[PDB]
A paper describes a structure:
During virus assembly, a primary role of the MA domain is to bring Gag to the inner leaflet (IL) of the plasma membrane via its covalently attached N-terminal myristate group and highly basic region (HBR). The MA HBR promotes Gag membrane binding by engaging in electrostatic interactions with the IL of the plasma membrane. The HIV-1 MA protein forms trimers that assemble into a hexameric lattice with central cavities at points of sixfold symmetry on PS- and PI(4,5)P2-enriched membranes. During HIV-1 maturation, the MA lattice undergoes structural rearrangement, with mature virions displaying a more regular hexameric lattice and smaller central hexameric apertures compared to their immature counterparts.
Here, we examine maturation of an MA triple mutant, L20K/E73K/A82T, which, despite replicating similarly to wild-type (WT) in some cell lines, exhibits distinct biochemical behaviors that suggest altered MA-MA interactions. Cryo–electron tomography with subtomogram averaging reveals that, although the MA lattice in immature L20K/E73K/A82T virions closely resembles that of the WT, mature L20K/E73K/A82T virions lack a detectable MA lattice. In addition to the significant density loss in the center of the L20K/E73K/A82T MA trimer, there was an unpaired density gain at the C terminus of L20K/E73K/A82T MA pointing to the CA layer (blue arrow), suggesting that this region is likely less flexible than the WT counterpart. Additionally, the electrostatic potential on the surface of MA facing the membrane is also more positive than the WT, due to the L/K and E/K changes in the L20K/E73K/A82T mutant. But more intriguingly, in L20K/E73K/A82T mutant VLPs, the intersection points became concentrated at the threefold axis, and the registration between the MA trimer and the CA trimer is much stronger than WT. This is consistent with the observation of a more ordered MA C terminus in the L20K/E73K/A82T mutant MA compared to the WT. In the L20K/E73K/A82T mutant MA, however, E73 is substituted with K73, which forms salt-bridges with E39 and E41 and transiently with other lipid headgroups but does not contribute to Na+ ion coordination. As a result, interactions at the trimer centers in mutant MA are only mediated by salt bridges with R42, making them less stable compared to WT MA. In the immature L20K/E73K/A82T mutant, the absence of central density, coupled with upward reorientation of R42 in the AlphaFold2 prediction, as well as the E73K mutation, is presumed to enhance interactions with lipid headgroups, consistent with the role of R42 in phospholipid binding. The collective structural modifications induced by L20K and E73K and the repositioning of R42 create a highly positive surface for phospholipid binding and docking, offering an explanation for the increased Gag binding affinity observed for the L20K/E73K/A82T mutant.
Numbering used by the authors:
A (entry chain c), B (entry chain f), C (entry chain g), D (entry chain e), E (entry chain F): 1 to 115
Write the structure that this text describes.
Amino acid sequence: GARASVLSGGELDKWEKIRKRPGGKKQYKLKHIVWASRELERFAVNPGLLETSEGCRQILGQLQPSLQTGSEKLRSLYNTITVLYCVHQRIDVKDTKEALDKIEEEQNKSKKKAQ
Amino acid sequence: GARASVLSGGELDKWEKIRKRPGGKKQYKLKHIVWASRELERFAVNPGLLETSEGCRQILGQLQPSLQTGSEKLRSLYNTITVLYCVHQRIDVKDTKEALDKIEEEQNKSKKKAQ
Amino acid sequence: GARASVLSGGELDKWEKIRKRPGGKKQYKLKHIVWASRELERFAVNPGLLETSEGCRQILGQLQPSLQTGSEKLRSLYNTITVLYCVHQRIDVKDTKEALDKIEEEQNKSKKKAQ
Amino acid sequence: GARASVLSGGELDKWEKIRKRPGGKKQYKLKHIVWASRELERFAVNPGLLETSEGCRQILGQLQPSLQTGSEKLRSLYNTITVLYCVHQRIDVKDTKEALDKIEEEQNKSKKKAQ
Amino acid sequence: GARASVLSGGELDKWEKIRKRPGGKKQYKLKHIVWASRELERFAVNPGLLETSEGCRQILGQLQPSLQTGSEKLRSLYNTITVLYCVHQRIDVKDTKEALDKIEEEQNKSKKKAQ
Ligand SMILES: *C(=O)CCCCCCCCCCCCC
Ligand SMILES: *C(=O)CCCCCCCCCCCCC
Ligand SMILES: *C(=O)CCCCCCCCCCCCC
Ligand SMILES: *C(=O)CCCCCCCCCCCCC
Ligand SMILES: *C(=O)CCCCCCCCCCCCC
């Protein structure tokens, strides 16, 4: 059943199409997904949350006060999970800037009805 | 990313613990997802819809008028798709009969707000 | 009682005396029923529906929407189910057209009491 | 009858100039027509309807109930028949996208008889 | 798509059952279609008009006010087009006279709606 993720136009096929910068050439690779698990394990957060959008969103919500002064690894991890949230929301983001704008669109859409 | 799904509590931890026959000593295995994938391909239906609860539920909606007249293979597929729906919904069902109770429970629940 | 499978003047004796095409001199065989089971098995329908009128009505209801554009084999199965219905009701019909007229007349009577 | 279908200036001559993508490298070939006739007999649809526009439209209707959750091959078959319908209607489409627009675009006139 | 015309029950198969004489024995043949194409080229007439009823109707309309003077060949062409017209409406006529009546018969209703 996990095979759905490797079908043409599925989530792992969609992931390695996404560009790092909005006009750049180098792409996102799946190695960043594996890398994320060990960082979550280090700080004692459950990697099982990266299975769905709803799980990814809990991680993204947690790190919001830390993020502003965060290291380059922490900000990059936040951007890496941001893309997993966008991919799990079925959004065909072409790059990081779009994924970040898509999160602001998701947060604006979410927050407006949840004050 | 499919590592997350096999961590305990994930979808492919839950899938293989569920009983086939309520007093039976046999449980559902991954072999029945490939069998469902073959039978859906034989019916010219997309097996990628098995990723999600809504895609499984759409397949359950599609095959419902054919169940009254359905074969052992069709009823067995309906039960296979039903358990995948229960797994995607994170419902801790122990067997086929609990999974069937949940579809009937959800359908009667659904009827009340569909009027 | 398997002895009833050779019943003289029964339904099986009549089956072999019913004409396939209405002016044609050639009759229905029991291997047609075996072929009908195999065609039903491909479309995932339960063969036991052949054995009762209650199942035959459901088969016809499911075949009718596809009849008009359906292939000759679909039409011949429709006619085969129609004759089995006439046989289960114990309606003597000499041929396929006679069976079709009797079943449409019985169905027409049913649809006046179906609302 | 319609032997004109394989002559210069005819339906095939036009068929093989229709592109897959507006400026695309590949075009449609005659052998898709032969394959489609074989596929229809598997579903048990009559292969004699294919020489007529309204028979082709009726076949497209018949393919709809599994199209929506349908496999890639079923969608490809439907779109290929759709382009052929446009060819039988003597519509000189530029490409695959136009054949898709023509179905909705022609139906807009007649769908205003149902508003 | 053209195979349908040669599959049993198709338009060529219907063509070939039609009598050349009202209560006759001899019928129309594929080699008459070849002959008809040869007669058309002699007067520089497009064959693509004999694909449909409307094209045939237009040719009959051109032929009609010249028939009184016409040769046995002109009458034969008129009869032949008329038979094709009836075939293209898919009317299983027994003979050439019936096909001719169908044209005058359409005029009894159509010309009365033309004024
Ligand atoms: C999701 O698609 C299931 C994960 C796969 C485990 C291996 C399956 C091997 C199947 C072999 C064929 C069994 C007969 C249907
Ligand atoms: C996402 O996590 C990428 C993972 C790439 C390696 C997968 C290795 C196999 C994981 C499933 C093992 C299941 C054992 C029962
Ligand atoms: C009598 O013993 C009751 C149980 C009957 C079981 C089924 C017997 C089927 C015999 C052959 C039927 C052939 C019909 C074409
Ligand atoms: C009526 O005029 C029908 C023609 C149908 C003939 C079908 C069999 C021969 C194949 C014809 C097409 C070949 C294209 C390469
Ligand atoms: C509508 O039905 C179009 C039918 C086209 C028939 C084409 C048949 C081609 C046969 C090729 C045989 C091999 C030649 C090397």
